Design a protein around this ligand. Structure first.
Ligand code: CA
Ligand code: CA
Length: 70
């Protein structure tokens, strides 16, 4: 009821390929769109760490929500 709806929507966005989870090469593909376009300049290896604060190496549904939260 207004909440989890738009929540699961954002999850699908990143998880366009599927798998039901976001990997390092996944979120990365989304970072380009979020920022714009970058031929080189590699530094995403740092962003993945910020999200992968679970040590699992991936982002699930629950972790996704926590990531959005401060
Ligand atoms: Ca995926
Ligand atoms: Ca994680």
């Amino acid at each position: 009821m207004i909440g989890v709806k738009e929540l699961r929507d954002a999850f699908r966005e990143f998880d366009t390929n599927g798998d039901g989870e976001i990997s390092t090469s996944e979120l990365r593909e989304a970072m380009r769109k979020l920022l714009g376009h970058q031929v080189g300049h590699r530094d995403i290896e740092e962003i993945i760490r910020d999200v992968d604060l679970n040590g699992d190496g991936r982002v699930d549904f629950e972790e996704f929500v926590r990531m959005m939260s401060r």
